[PDB]
């Protein structure tokens with residue numbers, strides 16, 4: 001979804017309505033500093049783009065880790081959609097045989113295809129999302145090396161070992177990350193945006209360099225949606241269809257915990 005901007009320090013992202021609505025709101029919220037600066041929409045190839053701060057500007061050869069936050073990674077309306085009018089996905093099927101050949105049902109196999117919520121619930125359960133409320137999605141590196149090979153990274157200790165490898169023994173980065181996550185947690189807990197929105201499919205982006213510069217920002221507000229009038233979430237309690245709960249803060253709590261653990265090793 002990304003394209004280079006004509007201005008130093010910025011990046012363009014393909015405009016989507018929910019995300020655009022979210023960024024505008026966030027620029028006036030307690031979370032303003034916890035997300036990339038949003039500077040408006042622009043037109044390029046007859047196409048609209050979010051004009052964003054490039055979070056990597058300011059770092060020297062940045063290392064990047066994307067952590068998808070939440071116990072739930074799809075909207076409830078996708079559950080409704082799958083029950084009234086399912087669109088079978090043959091792609092979402094072939095991976096399941098790869099990760100776990102006994103995972104698809106006898107019927108899914110005959111279909112060679114799976115619904116969206118089903119595929120997503122299974123991803124949640126073989127990774128750490130269901131149990132810890134986040135998961136690692138990818139790492140991008142200063143050495144050029146990228147990896148998304150984290151589909152079965154699930155246990156507390158597997159997660160810890162990915163971060164241990166990502167920070168490469170830099171106590172100052174790790175310290176800075178933890179200070180940033182504590183301050184983000186504090187912000188989320190008083191944010192008016194956060195208590196009025198179900199935050200699904202967003203990530204915390206960790207960015208550090210060999211100069212010990214470290215930052216974290218929330219990104220990807222494409223599936224982040226306002227709750228019905230005057231309704232709010234606690235972002236910790238289990239999701240049950242109907243309640244719209246995302247377990248975002250369960251995730252954050254556990255992530256902080258794992259980092260604090262790592263720092264004491």
Ligand SMILES: O=P(O)(O)O[C@H]1[C@H](O)[C@@H](OP(=O)(O)O)[C@H](OP(=O)(O)O)[C@@H](OP(=O)(O)O)[C@H]1O
Pocket residue numbers: 073074116123201222223
């Ligand atoms: O990560 P894998 O296991 O491949 O599954 C992907 C991701 O969950 C996507 O989220 P993200 O883009 O954050 O990676 C999701 O996009 P949505 O944001 O549209 O839910 C895709 O759904 P489809 O777009 O329906 O394929 C789904 O196929």
Ligand SMILES: Nc1ncnc2c1ncn2[C@@H]1O[C@H](COP(=O)(O)OP(=O)(O)O)[C@@H](O)[C@H]1O
Pocket residue numbers: 001011036052053054055056064066140203205219220221222
């Ligand atoms: N504002 C930003 N500045 C620099 N890099 C970004 C920024 N936002 C996202 N990225 C990079 O691009 C990746 C995907 O961003 P994301 O918002 O999840 O887009 P999408 O849902 O279209 O994949 C991130 O994991 C990160 O590596």
Ligand SMILES: [Mn+2]
Pocket residue numbers: 201220
């Ligand atoms: Mn994404």
